[PDB]
Amino acid sequence: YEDKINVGGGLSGDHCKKFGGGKTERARKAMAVEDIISRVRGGSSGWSGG
Amino acid sequence: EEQIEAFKSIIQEKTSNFNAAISLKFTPSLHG
Ligand SMILES: *[C@@H]1O[C@H](CO)[C@@H](O)[C@H](O)[C@H]1NC(C)=O
């Protein structure tokens, strides 16, 4: 403002923020157990055993 | 079998600006 005495003044501020976050987690587990046992009382020592 | 994976990502930013515009002029010889 000025009146004919002058007084001067001026201000201008600017602020800005930019935040970011990201997370990723992946798990994969597999377990398999297979057992096959055959008891044969056929009567063959070697050939029956095979 | 076992398998696991993990990912993470983070970004941060912060701006700032501060103007200042002030002028003085006076004239009622005298001048300012
Ligand atoms: C100055 O003022 C302008 C307009 O109001 C604004 O966009 C800017 O962020 C300010 N600061 C600067 C240019 O540093």
UniProtKB/Swiss-Prot annotation, chain A:
It comes from the Eukaryota. It is found in: Secreted; Target cell membrane. It comes from Homo sapiens. Belongs to the complement C6/C7/C8/C9 family. The chain crosses the membrane at residues 7-12. Component of the membrane attack complex (MAC), a multiprotein complex activated by the complement cascade, which inserts into a target cell membrane and forms a pore, leading to target cell membrane rupture and cell lysis. The MAC is initiated by proteolytic cleavage of C5 into complement C5b in response to the classical, alternative, lectin and GZMK complement pathways. The complement pathways consist in a cascade of proteins that leads to phagocytosis and breakdown of pathogens and signaling that strengthens the adaptive immune system. This is Complement component C8 alpha chain. It is linked to Complement component 8 deficiency, 1: A rare defect of the complement classical pathway associated with susceptibility to severe recurrent infections, predominantly by Neisseria gonorrhoeae or Neisseria meningitidis. The gene is C8A. Heterotrimer of 3 chains: alpha (C8A), beta (C8B) and gamma (C8G); the alpha and gamma chains are disulfide bonded. Component of the membrane attack complex (MAC), composed of complement C5b, C6, C7, C8A, C8B, C8G and multiple copies of the pore-forming subunit C9.
Swiss-Prot record, chain B:
It comes from the Eukaryota. The record marks H31, G32 as: Cleavage. The chain crosses the membrane at residues 18-25. This is Complement component C9a. It comes from Homo sapiens (Human). The lineage of its organism: Eukaryota, Metazoa, Chordata, Craniata, Vertebrata. The gene is C9.
